[PDB]
Design a protein around this ligand. Sequence first.
Ligand SMILES: Nc1nc2c(ncn2[C@@H]2O[C@H](COP(=O)(O)OP(=O)(O)O)[C@@H](O)[C@H]2O)c(=O)[nH]1
Ligand SMILES: [Ca+2]
Length: 168
Amino acid sequence: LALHKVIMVGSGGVGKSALTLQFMYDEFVEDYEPTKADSYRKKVVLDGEEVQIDILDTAGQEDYAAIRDNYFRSGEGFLCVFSITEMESFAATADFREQILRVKEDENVPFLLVGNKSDLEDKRQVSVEEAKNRAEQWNVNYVETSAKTRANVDKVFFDLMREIRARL
Ligand SMILES: Nc1nc2c(ncn2[C@@H]2O[C@H](COP(=O)(O)OP(=O)(O)O)[C@@H](O)[C@H]2O)c(=O)[nH]1
Ligand SMILES: [Ca+2]
């Protein structure tokens, strides 16, 4: 089977683990240990082909840069997650982008910019327009998700797999 290696990145509390666990187990999990990194694997049928997805749910606790870089180097595609309710998490996405680019050396690395917590529109701090503009600058797609309602959760993982499939 094809094995699509996805890495979740983004600053704290944006929904990396909630997105992962919604995708994996169809549950909205709200208290998942913020410092716990873990990997997940499951079989999925991608455009009719049975494949395996491997998801590395990073937690930013590998502060030792060689280790963090090794984790990123193993990834084939990235979900770069921020929370639409925390502007500082959107600002932080630039750092994850640079980190990935330093390691993968490929500006076309499979990569989605993911604005999570789309069910909290009344708490939005990051405009759709400014996030789309950043994605356009990076030539990546922008998708807004809700790990709570499941909105676009399958989409971000499947579309990222489609980029891995096409590009590698
Ligand atoms: N309302 C809402 N809350 C969310 C969503 N995703 C995550 N959360 C909450 O935000 C907190 C942090 O989520 P988590 O996935 O642990 O963040 P991480 O640090 O990026 O792994 C948790 O308390 C979740 O319940 C979402 O899409 N909508
Ligand atoms: Ca987490």
